[PDB]
Amino acid sequence: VAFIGITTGLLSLATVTGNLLVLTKLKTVNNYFLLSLACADLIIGTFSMNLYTTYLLMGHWALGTLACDLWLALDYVASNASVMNLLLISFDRYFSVTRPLSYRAKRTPRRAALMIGLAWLVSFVLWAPAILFWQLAGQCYIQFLSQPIITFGTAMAAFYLPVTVMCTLYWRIYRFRRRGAEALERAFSLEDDKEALLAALDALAEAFADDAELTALLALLRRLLELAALRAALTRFPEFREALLALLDRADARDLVWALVLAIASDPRYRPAVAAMIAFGDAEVLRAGLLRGAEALGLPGGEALVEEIMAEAEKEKKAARTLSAILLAFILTWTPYNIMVLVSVPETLWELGYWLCYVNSTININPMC
Numbered sequence: 001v002a003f004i005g006i007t008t009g010l011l012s013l014a015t016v017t018g019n020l021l022v023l024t025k026l027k028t029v030n031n032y033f034l035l036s037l038a039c040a041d042l043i044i045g046t047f048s049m050n051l052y053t054t055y056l057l058m059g060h061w062a063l064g065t066l067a068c069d070l071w072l073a074l075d076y077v078a079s080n081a082s083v084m085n086l087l088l089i090s091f092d093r094y095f096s097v098t099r100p101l102s103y104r105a106k107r108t109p110r111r112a113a114l115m116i117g118l119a120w121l122v123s124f125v126l127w128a129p130a131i132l133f134w135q136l137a138g139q140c141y142i143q144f145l146s147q148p149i150i151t152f153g154t155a156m157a158a159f160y161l162p163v164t165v166m167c168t169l170y171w172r173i174y175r176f177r178r179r180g181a182e183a184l185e186r187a188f189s190l191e192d193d194k195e196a197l198l199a200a201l202d203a204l205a206e207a208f209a210d211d212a213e214l215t216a217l218l219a220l221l222r223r224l225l226e227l228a229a230l231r232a233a234l235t236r237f238p239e240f241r242e243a244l245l246a247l248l249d250r251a252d253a254r255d256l257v258w259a260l261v262l263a264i265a266s267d268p269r270y271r272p273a274v275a276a277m278i279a280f281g282d283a284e285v286l287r288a289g290l291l292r293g294a295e296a297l298g299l300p301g302g303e304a305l306v307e308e309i310m311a312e313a314e315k316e317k318k319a320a321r322t323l324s325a326i327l328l329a330f331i332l333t334w335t336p337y338n339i340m341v342l343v344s345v346p347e348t349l350w351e352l353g354y355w356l357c358y359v360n361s362t363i364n365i366n367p368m369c
């Protein structure tokens with residue numbers, strides 16, 4: 001009777017005052033995609049939470065008609081915007097992993113802040129006029145969907161399909177990066193080996209697929225390790241041909257590949273693809289292998305590459321867990337309501353599940369720190 005108001009009263013203040021906090025550069029496209037999630041969470045956590053607080057009364061619902069439509073429209077627009085923005089984030093991560101050169105290079109604040117606008121527009125148009133322009137005593141529900149079949153269909157379409165897409169994409173990127181990290185780890189863990197030695201090159205080839213040139217080089221090196229353009233292909237590496245071709249005289253291929261990885265990671269154009277696999281690696285075996293490659297290169301200037309690559313690796317580990325925290329929170333909190341729609345329980349649990357989709361808001365901004 002009194003704890004209901006307190007829990008949903010402080011959460012709104014902990015969310016609204018916890019969401020205006022994220023609103024000084026930080027122009028990373030990840031932050032651009034998180035901005036819309038933060039705005040939708042703010043709108044929810046203030047308007048929908050307060051109106052549900054006022055709904056949970058002995059008079060069924062106060063301020064009917066107009067407010068019963070306005071609150072419903074705001075809730076069902078902001079929730080769809082949040083789901084579609086999470087889908088956008090997941091697809092962005094998947095394409096950044098899969099196409100690190102064709103697509104990851106062309107990620108700019110423009111042409112990515114336009115995909116954000118389409119996320120809201122295809123959601124606002126679908127949900128706002130469908131109920132606000134559709135024209136019990138206090139009951140407030142979307143009259144345009146007063147049926148069990150309709151609610152099951154909308155729940156499926158707006159939750160399970162995006163959820164299965166997100167899980168498939170996250171699992172795919174996790175496996176794609178994990179296999180490369182394992183192969184790279186075995187490249188140094190086992191010495192005088194051929195299987196792991198070729199596996200490292202295979203993982204490098206799979207990582208770089210959007211340029212064809214780097215792939216051609218990896219195919220050439222695979223053929224060499226088991227014609228005369230080996231030097232011409234290696235000429236793409238500046239200030240590195242003399243050392244690398246020296247190791248190409250002739251076993252010794254363990255030092256050649258580890259030297260090749262450092263040289264590939266040098267150019268910022270195709271660095272992040274290597275940085276991802278390094279980030280999901282053991283951080284010790286890969287560091288030792290990279291140091292071995294640097295020492296096999298002859299150390300022209302020094303170990304000026306290993307230090308910041310690990311810095312870029314950990315800056316990728318933070319972005320990997322942040323996606324997990326936001327996605328996992330959405331999966332856990334929204335599930336109780338969308339399993340209740342599956343079984344179609346008293347109103348004492350329908351309202352308990354309805355506000356469980358609002359506690360997703362407060363835990364959304366915590367990973368942003």
Ligand SMILES: CN1[C@@H]2CC[C@H]1C[C@H](OC(=O)[C@H](CO)c1ccccc1)C2
Nearest residue numbers: 076079080083154155158159337338357
């Ligand atoms: C209606 N509210 C309450 C609290 C927030 C919102 C969503 C929750 O219900 C759902 O998850 C459906 C699909 O099941 C849904 C509706 C709009 C957009 C995406 C998904 C319950």
